[PDB]
Amino acid sequence: HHMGNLNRCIADIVSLFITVMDKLRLEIRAMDEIQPDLRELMETMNRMSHLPPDFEGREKVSQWLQKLSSMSASDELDDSQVRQMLFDLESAYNAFNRFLH
């Protein structure tokens, strides 16, 4: 038994999307508490060579990473930013699932 890179990436991307969304639903707000998982999600999409270069889901995650890069470690996302991030992550997750079909 041996699992390939692609299937490991798919499992990690699905679990990271849901983990980041769940943290946001649990009122986790600090940049240093959300950003590391988001970075892990972005890098795993980057390791998934089968994704199209302009893939929608990666663009949404990247834009959030860029936004978080302007914050201090201790800065917190506000209610509006959390709701928007959840909408963007749901949209990126759905785009990933659509890609798989």
Q: Say which DSSP state 71 is in.
A: S
Strand partners, 76: 30
Name the nearest CA neighbour of 38 among 13, 63, 60, 61: 61
Q: Which H/E stretch holds residue 74? A: none
Method: X-ray
Distance, CA of 42 to CA of 48 (rounded, Å): 10
Distance, in Å, from the CA atom of 17 to the CA atom of 91, rounded to the nearest integer, reads: 10
3-state SS, residue 52: coil
| Domains, in order of start, for the chain | 1-101 (1.20.120.1130)
Angle at which helices 79-100 and 5-25 cross, to 10°: 150
Cα torsion at 54, 55, 58, 62 (round to 10°)? 30
One-letter identity of residue 69:
S
Of 61, 80, 79, 81, give the one whose Cα is nearest residue 71.
Answer: 81
Nearest to 58 by CA among 25, 9, 7: 9
Contact 23, 40 (CB under 8 A): no
| CA–CA separation, 18 and 46 (whole Å) | 18
